[PDB]
Design a protein around this motif. Sequence first.
Motif: not given
Length: 108
Positions: A25-39, A74-85
């Motif tokens: 239940e992603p509660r924002c489009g930016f979060s929804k896009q992130m989870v879709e890519i990861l899945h 990842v491994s405790g390090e900030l990778i970034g946000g949606l644009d970087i993913i």
Amino acid sequence: DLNLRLKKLTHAAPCMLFMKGTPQEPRCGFSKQMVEILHKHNIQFSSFDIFSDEEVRQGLKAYSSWPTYPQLYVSGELIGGLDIIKELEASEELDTICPKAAENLYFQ
């Protein structure tokens, strides 16, 4: 101590996603896009719902000097946000950077 708390949270799993809502239940489009890519990429990740704890939501922005969400660690390090993913996906390096689960069988 908040910094100690945020260190532990960002290192809670090999891959950690700070998002609005949950992956189901992603509660924002930016979060929804992130989870879709990861899945889609079969990335193994845990997550934290920033709506659940305002101290963490605001404290992590200051702790990581990253002014929005979602934020992937990842491994405790900030990778970034949606644009970087998206850029990593596009360059085909996402799967290299991130962890994935064993797909072994539980039967013979």
